[PDB]
Amino acid sequence: NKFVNTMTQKPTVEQLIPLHHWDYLYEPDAKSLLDGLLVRYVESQVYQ
């Protein structure tokens, strides 16, 4: 359920999976980091 307001609790369903100018320095590898960030993001939306 989503907290629309103090009087409204909207039941809802949303898709967890599947989902400027300059660029970042990557340590150790970009692929290594993308795999780690995506799990942290799904476990975050579930806790939310």
């Binding site: 100018h21 300059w22 660029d23 320095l25």
Partner: protein
């Protein structure tokens, strides 16, 4: 006399030839990291460009001495006067 003059032409070719070889390799190593810095920090390229010229004067310090001596040997050979 011919051996002094002939070997002087080769001394001249070694002075500027080794200088050309080292400055072209040196500016490829230096310039390659300048383009990378400009790609990572595009708004900072004016600073990176100014920082690069401080190294260019040091990279060409001994090479310009070799070029100066090479021209001296060609138009005022200091060995022909040594009998």
């Amino acid at each position: 006399m011919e051996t002094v003059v002939g070997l002087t032409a080769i001394a001249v070719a070694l002075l500027i030839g080794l200088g050309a070889l080292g400055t072209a390799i040196g500016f490829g190593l230096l310039g390659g990291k300048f383009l990378e810095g400009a790609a990572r920090q595009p708004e900072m390229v004016p600073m990176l460009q100014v920082k690069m010229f401080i190294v260019a004067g040091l990279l060409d310090a001994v090479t310009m001495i070799g070029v100066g001596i090479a021209l001296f040997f060609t138009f005022a050979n200091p060995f022909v006067g040594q009998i």
